[PDB]
Amino acid sequence: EAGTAFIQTQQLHAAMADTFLEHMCRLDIDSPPITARNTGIICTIGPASRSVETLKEMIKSGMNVARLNFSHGTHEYHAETIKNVRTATESFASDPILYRPVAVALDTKGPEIRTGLIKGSGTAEVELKKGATLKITLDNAYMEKCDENILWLDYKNICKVVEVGSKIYVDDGLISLQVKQKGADFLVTEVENGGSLGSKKGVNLPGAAVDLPAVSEKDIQDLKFGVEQDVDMVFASFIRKASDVHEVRKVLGEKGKNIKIISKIENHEGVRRFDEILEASDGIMVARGDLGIEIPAEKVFLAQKMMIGRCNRAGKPVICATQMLESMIKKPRPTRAEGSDVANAVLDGADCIMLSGETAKGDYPLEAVRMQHLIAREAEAAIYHLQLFEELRRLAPITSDPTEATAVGAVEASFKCCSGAIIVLTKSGRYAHQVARYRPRAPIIAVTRNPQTARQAHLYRGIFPVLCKDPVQEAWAEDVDLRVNFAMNVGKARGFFKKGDVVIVLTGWRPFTNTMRVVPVP
Amino acid sequence: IQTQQLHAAMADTFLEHMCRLDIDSPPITARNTGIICTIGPASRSVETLKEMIKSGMNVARLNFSHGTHEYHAETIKNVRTATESFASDPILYRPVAVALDTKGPEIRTGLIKGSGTAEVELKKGATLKITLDNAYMEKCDENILWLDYKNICKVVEVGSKIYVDDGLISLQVKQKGADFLVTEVENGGSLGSKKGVNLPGAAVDLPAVSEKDIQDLKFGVEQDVDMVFASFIRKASDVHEVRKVLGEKGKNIKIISKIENHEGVRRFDEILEASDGIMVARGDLGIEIPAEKVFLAQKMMIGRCNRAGKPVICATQMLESMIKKPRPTRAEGSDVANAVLDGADCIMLSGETAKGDYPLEAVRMQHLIAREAEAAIYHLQLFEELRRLAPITSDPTEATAVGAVEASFKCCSGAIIVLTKSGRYAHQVARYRPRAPIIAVTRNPQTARQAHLYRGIFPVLCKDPVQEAWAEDVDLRVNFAMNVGKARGFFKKGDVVIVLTGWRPGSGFTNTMRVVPVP
Ligand SMILES: O=C([O-])C(=O)[O-]
Ligand SMILES: O=C([O-])C(=O)[O-]
Ligand SMILES: [Cl-]
Ligand SMILES: [Cl-]
Ligand SMILES: [K+]
Ligand SMILES: [K+]
Ligand SMILES: [Mg+2]
Ligand SMILES: [Mg+2]
């Protein structure tokens, strides 16, 4: 009864524009998005978020992956976090239609440089003043006696790799020092950017050739523990070259061969060697914290868009990470730059977005998850699929692989009929990954019986994994129908589609494969 | 490898354009995006303003939500002293514009009672009375909060939500009185003095231009400001009211309408038509509408301003953490770059330069990011779309401008030089978004200041007398631009520049294009 005043939902007016400029001009704050949110949300778990009750609310608010940051905490601490994640996740298991799988990710310490403890108890801070002198020492006598005159750090070969004039950054790149003099085991620096210095802060040496191993002996111990704990993926810090990826993957053994290896790109060499790293990895994280200290801050967006583009071209997941909603560590609403950053990561093409301190340590973890969910849904509708899908196709090789032809045909069909979903029956995730790389607007409901697939599949934009718990039926056709009906019930229960809407169904492995059907929802 | 992201520039698709972006491809010297800096205690001294100018400030914004006319007059004096300290060399002098940002129909709280803690704690679930009784205007606390919107009780009802201090505190109306509201704190926090208030669910009925705004606008005319940033513009008639106040004496002052609420977004097209330009005023906007929708409104407004060829400013919290820290967050670096990639003519700093501890670092960081992002634009697609969407006309000047922009891409020119009295001829080039800087030579000091609002325009103020012969006077001004560009490192011998000049004496056509090897 409203009539012509109707505003198309999900930015469909902008979707139909014939140019990108007109697409922008048509973006409409009064055009509401769809229910389904395609971009996975990865949340770092820490003191603010590791209780079972908070984790339950995190899941309800949209967390898909729990990140364990092995830069901090001992193995028993991480074991208990994992236990709590699983308790919270399985509290929803009694209803498979509504159960959301939750993945567990181990983020390695890797070749970090860290300072020691401020003298006293270690919880104090000292003020470093601009122009003051500060001695960096490797003498362990001072490892718990750091102050404004002497700073211990843990990188034993630092004096080899820095020179007079080089810059040393401490604590998220906020404190900056210039090396004035060298010693056998010390550096004399001048404070450039001063500030308040606490304990065990991260140190960066931009332009220095740091020779620490990508995977140290202690990192291997963490990785082995990750295998014992049945983690789903590793986020490997400071990957510089393809062989670093192999050091991570091969040490997991046969037992860990299905764990996904995500290389974190956070230094200049990782950017330069990106193509070989991408080839060796299952996916990528744009680890912007270190990256924006190792390279000039003003260049990070170039590296981010380069890596997202190349991952989209390769069909491998890419995560945008770090400081996306940073002010929400302390405030209940984000800044305008933070809102923009989340939206633009999605528009760039990121498969997942991440929260670090906002969920690990901040005062508003649930609000931060909820805000990522809200922004991602709005941005997903604003993507200019007309151009994106054309470019992904043109840049995608002709092959004889019938499964790739099925996937692109399904995504094409999904756009042609504005489908409510692409339902995909998948054991390993592969068939669903193949659809996701063509970036449909419609959500991809990936039905699997493999619990690890259900967890890992969150890494791909658009995949909404659901875990079927029904026994396998002896008749293949009956077993397919059971899994398809499960997906239909999920989409109806979750509000993705209604009876009578059109959906695409890919029925998976058949003992041709992965037949496509375009059907009304029963 | 190739500088200026030229490898990415040659990609045949946007996706491959992204794939080719190269942190090791260094940008050109020239920075096309104007930087607008709010002046306040951190940045008001002549000494600091000189460094602000050296660091890249193009426009000084004065926020008339605070301060007296005496205070603002002294700020303007200091801006001018700093600007003219560089005037001894017309070739290395940068014009600096002055912008007056109105108070507008703002709602603010009163002063916290000064005998206790400077801020009071509003706790979730507590009662808080909102009063309009001026007896409490300087006695605000956790029990009673005065605000200055005298008609608030008429536009809210039981259940209405009230937001305070960048939308961080929220209250719900529980009961109404003659001159008060009983509220319950929904989202608590620490409350200081004179904080902004938003009523997103209410039809706020304050005037577009209050008596105070009239006084401030007339002061701006008297002070010879270059532009007004008009707060809370909701409709074309609001723009008309501002323009009427500026009047004949202020007729050449640019009116930039600030879009800060839902109605301004809804009525954007009529606002844009009457305005000279637009500010995406994201602070209020992201309280008035859901924070997750701001990027839609930002990209809509930038796109439409680009289609119209009118300047658009991205504003507010772009580098917010630099109020307290010497480096920005990763989201902040991203936000500045994406504003440029979106198409914003200018970017802005508020607390980062007005009140913070690192004003110069904030200006320098906007300069660095803008230059990198300008090189990363996909000009191939942008220029094609701007051409395709432009209004149809046989105007010789427009045709010459488009031809000059295409020529500039074809030879990767060091600059497009254009002569202009009032700005328009340079604006016409800028709207097609060349990669090459547009060196706009003028003898009009106000044009030189205002032209900063347009992406790519590098204004230069020629101070030489007019030459007797028209052709010799044109040549003098072109040669001035050549020497400025050479001295500033924009180009050198062996480069190629595009030169746009007028037809002949007595014509207003800028219809002559020369493609000039740089001597
Ligand atoms: O390690 C990280 O996640 C980073 O540095 O951004
Ligand atoms: O007024 C402003 O600049 C704002 O609200 O962003
Ligand atoms: Cl996903
Ligand atoms: Cl400019
Ligand atoms: K880590
Ligand atoms: K104002
Ligand atoms: Mg890191
Ligand atoms: Mg405002």
PDB file of N, CA, C and O in Angstrom, chain A residues 331 335, chain B residues 42 166 316-329 332 349-362:
ATOM      1  N   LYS A 331      35.974   2.201  24.267  1.00  0.00           N
ATOM      2  CA  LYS A 331      34.735   2.927  24.038  1.00  0.00           C
ATOM      3  C   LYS A 331      33.677   2.020  23.428  1.00  0.00           C
ATOM      4  O   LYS A 331      34.010   1.093  22.691  1.00  0.00           O
ATOM      5  N   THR A 335      35.252   4.676  16.043  1.00  0.00           N
ATOM      6  CA  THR A 335      35.447   5.934  15.338  1.00  0.00           C
ATOM      7  C   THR A 335      34.952   5.818  13.896  1.00  0.00           C
ATOM      8  O   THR A 335      34.677   4.726  13.374  1.00  0.00           O
TER       9      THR A 335
ATOM     10  N   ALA B  42      46.307  23.866  20.175  1.00  0.00           N
ATOM     11  CA  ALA B  42      47.517  23.160  19.783  1.00  0.00           C
ATOM     12  C   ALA B  42      48.195  23.767  18.570  1.00  0.00           C
ATOM     13  O   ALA B  42      49.368  23.472  18.324  1.00  0.00           O
ATOM     14  N   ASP B 166      29.736  12.608  21.436  1.00  0.00           N
ATOM     15  CA  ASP B 166      30.074  11.720  20.316  1.00  0.00           C
ATOM     16  C   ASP B 166      29.233  10.443  20.344  1.00  0.00           C
ATOM     17  O   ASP B 166      29.688   9.367  19.936  1.00  0.00           O
ATOM     18  N   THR B 316      36.355  14.123   9.763  1.00  0.00           N
ATOM     19  CA  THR B 316      36.084  13.751  11.151  1.00  0.00           C
ATOM     20  C   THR B 316      36.581  12.363  11.526  1.00  0.00           C
ATOM     21  O   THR B 316      36.157  11.345  10.961  1.00  0.00           O
ATOM     22  N   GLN B 317      37.495  12.347  12.498  1.00  0.00           N
ATOM     23  CA  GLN B 317      38.097  11.154  13.078  1.00  0.00           C
ATOM     24  C   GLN B 317      38.954  10.373  12.104  1.00  0.00           C
ATOM     25  O   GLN B 317      39.204   9.187  12.321  1.00  0.00           O
ATOM     26  N   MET B 318      39.469  11.032  11.070  1.00  0.00           N
ATOM     27  CA  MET B 318      40.282  10.321  10.091  1.00  0.00           C
ATOM     28  C   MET B 318      41.574   9.795  10.704  1.00  0.00           C
ATOM     29  O   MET B 318      42.023   8.702  10.352  1.00  0.00           O
ATOM     30  N   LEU B 319      42.191  10.568  11.603  1.00  0.00           N
ATOM     31  CA  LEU B 319      43.423  10.195  12.292  1.00  0.00           C
ATOM     32  C   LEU B 319      43.266  10.382  13.796  1.00  0.00           C
ATOM     33  O   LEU B 319      44.198  10.796  14.489  1.00  0.00           O
ATOM     34  N   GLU B 320      42.074  10.072  14.314  1.00  0.00           N
ATOM     35  CA  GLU B 320      41.677  10.467  15.667  1.00  0.00           C
ATOM     36  C   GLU B 320      42.676  10.054  16.736  1.00  0.00           C
ATOM     37  O   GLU B 320      42.936  10.823  17.666  1.00  0.00           O
ATOM     38  N   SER B 321      43.224   8.841  16.664  1.00  0.00           N
ATOM     39  CA  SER B 321      44.128   8.414  17.735  1.00  0.00           C
ATOM     40  C   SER B 321      45.376   9.287  17.824  1.00  0.00           C
ATOM     41  O   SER B 321      46.043   9.285  18.867  1.00  0.00           O
ATOM     42  N   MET B 322      45.687  10.063  16.781  1.00  0.00           N
ATOM     43  CA  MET B 322      46.847  10.942  16.802  1.00  0.00           C
ATOM     44  C   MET B 322      46.639  12.189  17.643  1.00  0.00           C
ATOM     45  O   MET B 322      47.588  12.963  17.797  1.00  0.00           O
ATOM     46  N   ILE B 323      45.448  12.390  18.214  1.00  0.00           N
ATOM     47  CA  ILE B 323      45.312  13.368  19.287  1.00  0.00           C
ATOM     48  C   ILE B 323      46.302  13.060  20.403  1.00  0.00           C
ATOM     49  O   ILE B 323      46.881  13.973  21.001  1.00  0.00           O
ATOM     50  N   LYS B 324      46.531  11.767  20.684  1.00  0.00           N
ATOM     51  CA  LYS B 324      47.376  11.355  21.791  1.00  0.00           C
ATOM     52  C   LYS B 324      48.615  10.578  21.389  1.00  0.00           C
ATOM     53  O   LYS B 324      49.483  10.370  22.242  1.00  0.00           O
ATOM     54  N   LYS B 325      48.729  10.131  20.141  1.00  0.00           N
ATOM     55  CA  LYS B 325      49.833   9.265  19.753  1.00  0.00           C
ATOM     56  C   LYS B 325      50.499   9.797  18.491  1.00  0.00           C
ATOM     57  O   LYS B 325      49.830  10.403  17.644  1.00  0.00           O
ATOM     58  N   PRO B 326      51.800   9.542  18.308  1.00  0.00           N
ATOM     59  CA  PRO B 326      52.518  10.131  17.170  1.00  0.00           C
ATOM     60  C   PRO B 326      52.354   9.393  15.855  1.00  0.00           C
ATOM     61  O   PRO B 326      52.880   9.864  14.847  1.00  0.00           O
ATOM     62  N   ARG B 327      51.642   8.275  15.845  1.00  0.00           N
ATOM     63  CA  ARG B 327      51.410   7.469  14.659  1.00  0.00           C
ATOM     64  C   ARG B 327      49.948   7.062  14.693  1.00  0.00           C
ATOM     65  O   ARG B 327      49.394   6.859  15.775  1.00  0.00           O
ATOM     66  N   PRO B 328      49.310   6.900  13.535  1.00  0.00           N
ATOM     67  CA  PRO B 328      47.894   6.532  13.498  1.00  0.00           C
ATOM     68  C   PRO B 328      47.691   5.025  13.597  1.00  0.00           C
ATOM     69  O   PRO B 328      48.625   4.242  13.451  1.00  0.00           O
ATOM     70  N   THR B 329      46.442   4.637  13.858  1.00  0.00           N
ATOM     71  CA  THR B 329      46.098   3.223  13.785  1.00  0.00           C
ATOM     72  C   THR B 329      46.033   2.777  12.324  1.00  0.00           C
ATOM     73  O   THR B 329      45.973   3.584  11.394  1.00  0.00           O
ATOM     74  N   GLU B 332      42.933   4.067  10.633  1.00  0.00           N
ATOM     75  CA  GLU B 332      43.047   5.473  10.271  1.00  0.00           C
ATOM     76  C   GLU B 332      43.851   5.653   8.993  1.00  0.00           C
ATOM     77  O   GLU B 332      43.450   6.416   8.112  1.00  0.00           O
ATOM     78  N   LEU B 349      41.258  17.396   9.283  1.00  0.00           N
ATOM     79  CA  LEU B 349      41.678  17.105  10.646  1.00  0.00           C
ATOM     80  C   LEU B 349      40.929  18.051  11.571  1.00  0.00           C
ATOM     81  O   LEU B 349      40.748  19.226  11.252  1.00  0.00           O
ATOM     82  N   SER B 350      40.456  17.502  12.696  1.00  0.00           N
ATOM     83  CA  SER B 350      39.704  18.251  13.688  1.00  0.00           C
ATOM     84  C   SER B 350      40.502  18.268  14.968  1.00  0.00           C
ATOM     85  O   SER B 350      41.456  19.040  15.088  1.00  0.00           O
ATOM     86  N   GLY B 351      40.188  17.406  15.945  1.00  0.00           N
ATOM     87  CA  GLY B 351      40.926  17.412  17.194  1.00  0.00           C
ATOM     88  C   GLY B 351      42.402  17.146  17.004  1.00  0.00           C
ATOM     89  O   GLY B 351      43.230  17.638  17.773  1.00  0.00           O
ATOM     90  N   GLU B 352      42.752  16.384  15.966  1.00  0.00           N
ATOM     91  CA  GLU B 352      44.148  16.061  15.713  1.00  0.00           C
ATOM     92  C   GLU B 352      45.012  17.305  15.576  1.00  0.00           C
ATOM     93  O   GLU B 352      46.187  17.292  15.969  1.00  0.00           O
ATOM     94  N   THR B 353      44.477  18.379  15.002  1.00  0.00           N
ATOM     95  CA  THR B 353      45.240  19.611  14.888  1.00  0.00           C
ATOM     96  C   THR B 353      44.787  20.699  15.847  1.00  0.00           C
ATOM     97  O   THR B 353      45.601  21.555  16.200  1.00  0.00           O
ATOM     98  N   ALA B 354      43.530  20.668  16.301  1.00  0.00           N
ATOM     99  CA  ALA B 354      43.028  21.754  17.140  1.00  0.00           C
ATOM    100  C   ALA B 354      43.485  21.598  18.580  1.00  0.00           C
ATOM    101  O   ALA B 354      43.812  22.590  19.236  1.00  0.00           O
ATOM    102  N   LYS B 355      43.545  20.367  19.075  1.00  0.00           N
ATOM    103  CA  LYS B 355      43.736  20.129  20.500  1.00  0.00           C
ATOM    104  C   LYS B 355      44.811  19.110  20.830  1.00  0.00           C
ATOM    105  O   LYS B 355      45.285  19.095  21.976  1.00  0.00           O
ATOM    106  N   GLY B 356      45.268  18.315  19.880  1.00  0.00           N
ATOM    107  CA  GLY B 356      46.091  17.173  20.194  1.00  0.00           C
ATOM    108  C   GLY B 356      47.544  17.506  20.414  1.00  0.00           C
ATOM    109  O   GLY B 356      48.005  18.632  20.257  1.00  0.00           O
ATOM    110  N   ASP B 357      48.282  16.469  20.764  1.00  0.00           N
ATOM    111  CA  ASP B 357      49.694  16.572  21.091  1.00  0.00           C
ATOM    112  C   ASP B 357      50.599  16.435  19.876  1.00  0.00           C
ATOM    113  O   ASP B 357      51.801  16.705  19.990  1.00  0.00           O
ATOM    114  N   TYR B 358      50.048  16.058  18.712  1.00  0.00           N
ATOM    115  CA  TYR B 358      50.857  15.778  17.524  1.00  0.00           C
ATOM    116  C   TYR B 358      50.253  16.410  16.277  1.00  0.00           C
ATOM    117  O   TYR B 358      50.059  15.740  15.268  1.00  0.00           O
ATOM    118  N   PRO B 359      49.970  17.712  16.305  1.00  0.00           N
ATOM    119  CA  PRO B 359      49.328  18.328  15.135  1.00  0.00           C
ATOM    120  C   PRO B 359      50.160  18.219  13.871  1.00  0.00           C
ATOM    121  O   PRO B 359      49.621  17.925  12.795  1.00  0.00           O
ATOM    122  N   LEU B 360      51.468  18.436  13.962  1.00  0.00           N
ATOM    123  CA  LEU B 360      52.285  18.408  12.760  1.00  0.00           C
ATOM    124  C   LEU B 360      52.372  17.007  12.193  1.00  0.00           C
ATOM    125  O   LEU B 360      52.305  16.822  10.977  1.00  0.00           O
ATOM    126  N   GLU B 361      52.522  16.006  13.059  1.00  0.00           N
ATOM    127  CA  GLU B 361      52.567  14.633  12.591  1.00  0.00           C
ATOM    128  C   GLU B 361      51.274  14.256  11.886  1.00  0.00           C
ATOM    129  O   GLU B 361      51.287  13.502  10.907  1.00  0.00           O
ATOM    130  N   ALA B 362      50.142  14.756  12.375  1.00  0.00           N
ATOM    131  CA  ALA B 362      48.872  14.431  11.736  1.00  0.00           C
ATOM    132  C   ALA B 362      48.784  15.041  10.340  1.00  0.00           C
ATOM    133  O   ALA B 362      48.361  14.366   9.395  1.00  0.00           O
TER     134      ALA B 362
END
